[PDB]
Structure formats: structure tokens, C-alpha cells
Amino acid sequence: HWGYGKHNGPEHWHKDFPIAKGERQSPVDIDTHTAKYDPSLKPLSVSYDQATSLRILNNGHAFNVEFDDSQDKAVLKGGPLDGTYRLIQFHFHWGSLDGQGSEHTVDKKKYAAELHLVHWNTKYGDFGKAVQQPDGLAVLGIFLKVGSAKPGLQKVVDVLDSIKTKGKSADFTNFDPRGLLPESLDYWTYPGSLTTPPLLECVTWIVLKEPISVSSEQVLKFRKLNFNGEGEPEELMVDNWRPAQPLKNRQIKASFK
């Protein structure tokens, strides 16, 4: 099965998922001097007041915090997007040490981690239909650097003990994802893909310029999770990031001057 190790990591994924070598793969390096300001881009509208989180799951590659997406509650609109995109889950990618872990890079800089808030385009009715469309998904990406603690992350950190191994889940209601956002909503945007198999080319990426700070203790707890299931040899869940992929014939646009 695919993973992040020597024998099943990103360099192998193309064998089962040939789109890994496709024309709009993610992540990418954001070259800040080539990304052009686009005055036609709109402010991002993040409407999370009515979010209903349900559960947190260790899926064997990361952990997902899942939301009720059965009705318009937490939605992303504006920015580069046409229409309304509903929040379905968020997860992170992170490193074994603070100097790596992000998927996107900024002028080749790797952050300690990267948060992905995954949303699907409601014009397609359900997530499964949305991932058959080139504008089916919008992912809001937020970099994490190590410094001061992020208070809004601590509830996540504190439940991880209970989902140590693949396939474990726990109730995770009443979590407010607004507490994971930075001050500024300035962003870069480009067309891309899932960064995990099946690597589907459905995503409008919206990557915030401003990182959030989290404490060393917070990210250290991420690194105590396990890729393996209960009763199997312990493989720490670290370095669950895909490296930057070729930009090809794409443009990265900046929302800010």
C-alpha cells in the first residue's frame, strides 16, 4: 500500500496512480517573485461560524477532523472561487524535525507543517461527484512554524493520545476551526491536485501567506502518532508530506500587492 517510506513513498506512487506524473500535480514551490498580483481576485470569504465537527480519525497517513457537510454550514467562497464550497475535513502534514513538513514551499522554504482545510463544490451535489470535476475541490492551505503555542490547536493535540494508531477514531464535536486561522487572509492560488493518492486533479489551491505559530510541544505530539495499526511494530507518523512537483503550464496568482 502507498505511504511515505522508502519502498512505498512519493517516488513510487505513479505505478498505481499514473496521474502522479500529470499536468496539474500538487504541491508546488511558490516562487514569490514570479507569482503575479491579480487585482481581479476577491477577498476570501471563510464562513465557519456554524461548523459542526464530528470526529477525529487516524487514517494511517494523517489524522482527519471531519465535519457535517450534509448542509451549507462551514463554507468557503470568494477569492478565486465561483460558487460555494463546503468544508468536509481538515488534516495536517508534518515533519520529523522543524525544518521540514510542509508540502507547499515558499521560495524553497519548508515549514514545520501544513494544515489543509478541504472543501467541495456544492454544484456537484456530493464529494464523490465533485472529485470527478476539474473545479470540484478547494483546499485552504496554512503553514505552521514553531514558536508560540496556538491556543485553538490545543484541543486537537490533547485528543491525539486516543487515536494513536491507524483506524482509531474519537468523538470530536464542537471544535471551532476559526481558531486555526492566521490574522491575514492574503493568499496565493493555482490549479492543482490532491497531494495524496489518488492524486486527483480537482483542486483550486488557496495557500495563505501568513503562517500560524504552534509550539514545539504541540508539533511534538503530532510526531507521537503512528502510521501502523494497533498491535503492529511502531512506525512514527512523521514526514507525511509529498515534495514539490513540476509547475508545468500553470500560473500562481497573488491576492495581495
Ligand SMILES: NS(=O)(=O)c1cc(C(=O)O)c(NCc2ccco2)cc1Cl
Ligand atoms: N492533501 S490534500 O489536501 O490534497 C487531500 C488529502 C486527502 C487525504 O485522504 O489525505 C483527501 N482525501 C479525500 C479524498 C479521497 C478522494 C479524493 O479526495 C483529500 C485531499 Cl484534497
Ligand SMILES: [Hg+2]
Ligand atoms: Hg492512509
Ligand code: NA
Ligand atoms: Na507568474
Ligand SMILES: [Zn+2]
Ligand atoms: Zn493534505
